[model samples]
Target chain A: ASMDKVFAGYAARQAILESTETTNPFAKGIAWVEGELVPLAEARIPLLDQGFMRSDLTYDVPSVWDGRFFRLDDHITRLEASCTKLRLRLPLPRDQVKQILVEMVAKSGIRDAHVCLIVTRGLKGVRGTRPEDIVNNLYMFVQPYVWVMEPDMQRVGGSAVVARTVRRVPPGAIDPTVKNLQWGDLVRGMFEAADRGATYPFLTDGDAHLTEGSGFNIVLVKDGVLYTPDRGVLQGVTRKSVINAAEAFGIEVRVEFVPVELAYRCDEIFMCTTAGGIMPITTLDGMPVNGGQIGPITKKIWDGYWAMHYDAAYSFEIDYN
Target chain B: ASMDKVFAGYAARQAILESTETTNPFAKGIAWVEGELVPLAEARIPLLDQGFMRSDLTYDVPSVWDGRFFRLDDHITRLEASCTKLRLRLPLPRDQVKQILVEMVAKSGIRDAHVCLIVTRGLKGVRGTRPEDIVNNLYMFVQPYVWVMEPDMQRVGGSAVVARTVRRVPPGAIDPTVKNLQWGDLVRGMFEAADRGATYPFLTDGDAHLTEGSGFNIVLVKDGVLYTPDRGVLQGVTRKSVINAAEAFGIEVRVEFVPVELAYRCDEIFMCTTAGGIMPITTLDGMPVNGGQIGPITKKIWDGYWAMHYDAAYSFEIDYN
Candidate 1:
């Protein structure tokens, strides 16, 4: 196939960037820091803030589909739960946070936008070690949509390698469900995949059970049932939607441990994240995940997942005009 | 003892902060972002910078002691190695980086300061996953000396807990050798220690071998022999000095696995970091290490470690005037 045909929707991706990109792209974009909306270039936090210093921050990225935020409350609830786990308080209330997200996307004038909400363990006092000594800060921003997999890659299916060099961080250390920024392992796992000629990598627990990819959850399909590793993985909102969609379609879903060996036996496999929604994995390591094609069920779920973006039950709309 | 006496050096810490504190403390600190020296509050990286988003950065904190940088070269070398490991490039040369650190401290006019050198994977392109597409950045700053333990806490010896809820991030996931900001586990470990009325927490490997504390290395003294976990821990520069200090003092030092049970059996235990130097751990999980007193060997090593600061072999002299 010609590269042009393969990249048919490439302009759409570029449109998102062109709409947000500025002469100083770094200084572009819209940001709400603390209670004030500032230009992206001026949205600065204290250098000593533990959030930037120690990765003591939790963030959620909820994208807009057809001018509506897909599962914003779910992401916010997860963010609040993460803040509770980390003992970080938001300087702004939940309703205010939601309002900021709405205003950020509304002001940016981008219908399909990727929005990020970050809560950081703010500055520390002169002499204290407790969390109460520190204040917390909220930072929110809007950017062009970011896809974990390219349009062509999603169409043909994405490729991933099982990382032997790195494992998923154990939950005992820090719960993977918090969606914090402790991604050293996951980044190294991506490098491992790149080294093996794959676009991404899937990590396993110390017990050799498949956990997740860099920013996505791993899903496996065997026979007619859909299975995703239940533990030692980030509970992605998209994964929840995928599970729900599968159930709605009368397909059985299992939220159980997926052994690494099962990847070889599975008829189809895929990855799911809020960024790209559902991306089919046609190849695992170098081997084809069932003849190296996007499986029928995987395609169906992907279609169903996007269809729900227009479904009032799942998505909340914002009037960007 | 009175609370005033127990908090004897609390005033000194307060004095340090008061001296450095500006009307806008967030805007106060001296920072070099990319290549521009700016106020701490003004130093901002892009919200999309991979360093902030993916934790795709590595950093080192080396201290200035008695008007001289302690092992600045060692830290820079380690920083270079970390950049290599993360496939991040230094926007400037190594000598320039070293010069920048010198200039930052010299410009700060603070006699004793903690200097941080951070190299981030920089900004990612709109569409690329390769490391080459991104531009790496350098951020350096000098702050008032940060101590892992307070003066009184150090004098009376510190306390720690063996975390039952957290484990060391396995080397396969992220090599603990590379000094980076992937410290979510360590911070949670600190919280665990706090919950149990201890100053810090010591993490263990999957096999129950002691790994390290949040920002320090764990050292065990038993039968006059110094033992520290050799594997699955950061190769701390202070740890290296402690080992050399023991060897110079005719004390046996073993860099090997330290089992959790040894925390109870050891005659004396301590933690070491660039910030705190050497601090004895008198209590472990509420049990005293040798009757809740600092051990003789720990004292000797502590004294020897400080003496070598002026030994001219291990320390680097910086002209701060």
Candidate 2:
């Protein structure tokens, strides 16, 4: 009910610009003003923009502390990349994005924060120009992030039943990379997977090769080698870093096609990403990946990955309190 | 004419921002801005977004204008290579992109150009979350281009004989290379090719190989060799360039995919790409691509690909006469 209440004014025209009258945790304090990023609840864009209509847009997510952004550059790089792929120009440059993100996080006054920046293809009608036909309309805002899992859940481990559903559409179909500008397909698959009582489902290519999960990279530990799907799967930042750290521990890593059977029968299984860090998957499709408890290898990999996130150089030093 | 104009609006909508504004030109146009090339229209996006709604949308396209954008750095190298394959963050670094492409092209303001770009997946709704959600989108657009035969059709000997309908769609079920934003597959294919009485009719993939048109790429003879079929029969740049130019040099180039028997009997053939340059087709369907056309050794590489435009560039630069 609370999240619903927060999402209420999200689609409302006038209510979006009125900061003082909003309650959405993410949109309430910050504002979008007439296609520009601004302070207060004033951010707005013409309803005809491709970002709204055709959905040619890009965006970012950055951790914040006391109104400051963490890993801002990494996020900006990713956002701009999305813009480039969509042919939508970036409204603001790296410097401009940095300023906007920092300002949004700072103004939000959240000591520990997470920030998002959106760059949309500018305004145009059906007969107008292409994605490159528009200018960049930018938007940004902040919110205090609350972890969903229990603290012990991080150590005690979480469960994920195996899902027959695959990770993404075939590459020739729709690239598995670009973020989420168009998603009617994903919505249907994800809904079906979740309705069956699974936290998330893993998907494969039409050819039946192991791909990935709803949002995380799936990995299997076999004979001391860390295995994950290659290329066609989206190139994940955290996934890459985690693999790098795994290599640092002299763990052998390989990128190969993972079969459905291998995914369910691995000695250890886990999902690694920015928000969740490294989450050990204790169960897959009603069967335990290992002992149904956090595996030793999963803990070791998580330990190495966590250390990188806590590194002041990689992440912003915010008051955890 | 009515059928050709029927779905023109749909194509324009998927491409040109101003779909109904023009009664003639089928696709839209892209423009240059502040040393940056963007669409002539504005495409805006919101900041705190979900996938497509949040910036994780996806897109793609193939281009064929003076052959410059065959492999756009934005779509191929920087953007596609850099953005995060994982939906959580972008894959590539942005600074690298700004520095590279901003200075890559000379601002010649040339009138004939072709570009295709797409956008997908990056940001989540409201916050830096939804990395685990099953939501994605795809969008693509190709800018207005200067056709190879438009300027010198008659004197240059350009003629098309209508053939039976052989649409571009394959099986009506498979995801194709055509960017996902637009539909009208079979209808558009029938209209553009079959109705035109082109020298060849288009063919759908599953229908069998020889059943297709050499729509853009075809092979011909002079001394002898076999050619044709690039981008797997997709409409491509240079399909006519090499053919027409060879004719200008007293060499005959066929821009069609006749049967294997016809290809083997032919003297020469070739295929083309934006970056691959023009390559003679030595064989086709299944025959020897003998050294043919312009005597093979007399290959005329359009090293002066730059001059043709400049020579005519100023033609459009006049005051009302």
Candidate 3:
């Protein structure tokens, strides 16, 4: 079967990997570095890694649940596309990289794992203008699933502020079509939120149009229509699923850049990310959204999100022994 | 002897390190990581380091020539300031960290080297809202001298264009008064330059006012008055030296942001950085600034930059056995 290597071979490797695991010094998590499946907590990348040094890298998070993967292929597809956009190349062919990712999760042993795939521009080795001479590094890690928003925070519905101090690095500066680590703006926005006593911060473009939150994409439902930024935000995989789910429920969705003034008055607002599925927002700048409560639309999608996870196309049960 | 640990004891440490160095596996580069002096190439940090993952880091570069360090204290001063601005704490006291940096270079035995100091918000360990939980890491390294523009290029001057598409992430987003790793806008501007047959790109602010270049600061001279951006640019250590030099030479210096149009017709333009002192820019937007040749003002500073390295207050010669 075409799935033998990624599926069956993964089981065999996990069995063999443990034989050495007893004496090996490994941490609670696991990571795939180069060819070795090492302890995730112990994994280290060089400080000079251009990825670390220059923020010249791209990454994707393909989460797992109930011993299964969610939209693994779509994430990898985005990974490849991101590499292309940044003039970076994947270390291995897409198929091999995908297989290795699956193998990492099976070995990590955490069914509800947060898996991350990272590709760095590698090293300068020597300096020059030529991109062809550069080598790219692929680093993958699996940890207990990380949520952009904690479940507890999600339950009460999050509080947020449109950051007044920081603005998103615009599309012209960095292509937000792909996820990136250039969070100077996002991180600063986080601090802004903390200072303002809000749960999180949503950044705006230089023009003061709402962009996205520090780690998740934003969607505001105004008068029964869903709106997300059409620019300066990542095309998140979880965001796609939420949109799909919302449309199925007979709601009109608009992919348009939202203004803060308009966002402040929205009836319902929610955030979506791979790590945290659907989180509602009840407070904007300390004011209530829809009477300071999670709306029916968000609850419907939240319920549907769990049900949709087992959808055959989006789920892959890692056959672990 | 307050200098005992940093200066005199450094000699003793160098003697002892080489005893193991003869049989040890180390790369040409030397790095200090968590009290361990290891091969810079070999040293690694956990993949989850916020610095690498979220660009949550700040750094400084202080260079060495003829076994002497240039502007070491100033660089570290800014390093401390940068940490404060980003709300990051240093693992050791500022003075102790400074001593260790000197010790690393001494053990490495490089007369002329490029020294960099990095501070990263270490690890999430576990996720929570409290800033006190995040551990910070200090990573320092020394290698053969690195230059922003090669000496050869400096002779003829560099070629750069005002990036048409991109703009600098503004002060409201992230304070540019300190050196940071948020290079999304900077890196993207580089690509725009590459595609346009230019050597590098100069990013503007949202209002199209010139901010700075990717890795260096820009200065323009109009009829003998010097001008650098007042906002949206790092308060670079090397840039500080250049301004002082210009002031001493009786050249008027303005710390005001420049417009792209004003920058285009400058009588002379040059870049300043710790790695490359004073590099002249002869071309802007594929057009010659001063008939495609280095100007009298640029040449004076270029020549002075190298000579100034041996100045007593700024230079500290390493005693290599």
Candidate 4:
């Protein structure tokens, strides 16, 4: 009887679970809207959806490596945590959501792909902020993998600057731990970096403590010790991976306050994100770190990260059949 | 030659500017989306519109009073300033936008109606925080007049409690001056207030200085002087109106830091918003302000506000024809 009930519920939302039939899933990415696998172009929500109107949504991005997902459970757990913070109720159960994500990526046929899971505080009939009356919706898509730092930049190491025009948002106001789309300051910081002839920007808190890069976390290595900003940043999944990778290699790591002045004495620096994996920061604020080259410790961590990607513990291989 | 250019521009976007034909303008509200007047139900933007996605937008709300717009120029000025701060470039000229606002409300036919002007960062091809790559969009709508504080509460005066769970976002993070949809904290604050049996909630800065109520400005009058928070709040249009009204009536008003302790000696307290013209607050954190009754100065200012609403100086009469 319990099995029948589960099947009935699954039958009702069968469309949402089924992958869209595409002749070239590799070329044309697949998108799963509220209840169906639709063409990527058709995956849209209403204008007044609170996700867009109020930034009342939380999202997660996980990459597939060789048909396997990296830390899929961690990403979903974070996504659910974000929804809980906003009091957002998802339309489906967590297991169903997990199934949909697995199916969507499996159907895409791309071994190396990036998947996005977005949960939005759905449409409120008219414009107002009453969380109790709102329903939330889940949307997902699988796209061809795109590097956060371009491959060429990754080879030589990426460049960043301390933004003069933008600062990290205080956690008291909006918790940075919840990954949402309120990046106006981050966007401005990017332009500020560009104007200064740098590729990316890192922000500081009001007290001048390093916070984070645009969508990535910052780690500084000095005399064989790895230090990242402990406050005012997303507890990035890949950030954790990098920490684990370093610890596995017997390098000292600390989640501590990193100051702008510390960069002067830093032997090495790197930025971490799910999109980019691990990238060395060769330049900071017009100055080079470790004579403008990727450091040995960073190289070791990078190699360890790739090795973990092939391991069953961190990476879950999808069953295409 | 200049007239010809203006005419050419109008001719090109006439479709967007034209009024949507409705049977009863009074019964059916009108909305302006992108460039054209559309049915209220059809006034929707895309799901990926940065306005909704990134909260990469700024907005303003001004109301019509007895068929006249209250401080139309001020509202537009503030809206433009918000766009400038976010670097949102509108597709149409400011004058054209002005006409659309006028047309939207005139078409709505509500003598007392609230209007919203929203400008969002347009769609980026994909999800990323590179602001330079994205265009911007403008959206506006007019709805039937609604009250933030209902009439019954206005007569008896509303109740408010300081939120313990939420605090005002510091200016360094996201400038509260630019009206945008980032109300997660505010919504949580409202729930906190409700738990205490209060109708409204006010937030405080990290230092415990009074900031603002949800969607409204907080003003406290002690010993015949009016004081509002100096930091961490939107310079509300209605707040500006209240200040002007108080000044015109020869009432002394001060914009300064108001700590929570000041509420103990407050003779009168009230919340201000464009939605609810000016409503008195009789209780603060379960205690009465001046014995839970509206004060003389609050009544005087309320009367003055309605008078100014009808006055030609602050209100602009709409020409529906």
Docking quality of model 4: it rates as acceptable
* Candidate 4 segments exceeding 4 Å error: A1-28, A125-132, A319-321, B1-28, B125-133
Q: Which stretches of candidate 2 lie over 4 Å from their true place?
A: A1-44, A65-70, A125-133, A146-156, A161-167, A318-321, B1-321
What DockQ does candidate 4 score? 0.38
Residue-level lDDT tens digits of model 4 in A1-321? 122332244344333333433445433467886577865655666656667656777888888866789888889889889878766665788899889888887776666667888888777622344646767777788876667786557667988898877798777767789897888677677768878988778888878789997789998899999999988899999889988888888898899888888877899988999887888899888888879998888888876776677788898889877
Candidate 1 lDDT over residue span A210-275, tens digit each: 999888999899999988999998899999999888988999989998889999899999899988
Instruction: Enumerate residue pairs that collide in model 3.
Output: A165-B172, A166-B173
TM-score of chain A of 3: 0.89
TM-score of 2: 0.50
What's the TM-score of each model vs. the native? Answer: 0.92, 0.50, 0.90, 0.88
Quality class of the docking in candidate 3, CAPRI style: medium
Looking at model 2, give its docking quality level: incorrect
- Position B241, candidate 4: lDDT: 81
Indicate which candidate wins on lDDT.
Answer: 1
Ranking by lDDT: 1, 3, 4, 2
> What TM-score quantifies how close candidate 1 is to the native fold?
0.92
Better of 2 and 3 by TM-score: 3
How many backbone clashes does every candidate have?
0, 117, 2, 3
lDDT of 2 by residue, B253-289 (tens): 4444455444445554433433223334432333344
Alpha-carbon deviation at B105 in model 2, angstroms: 46
Q: Report how far off residue A277 is in candidate 3 (Å).
A: 0.5
TM-score of chain B of 3: 0.89
What tens digits encode model 3's per-residue C-alpha lDDT throughout B211-280? 8888889989889888889888998877787776777788888999688788877899988887767878
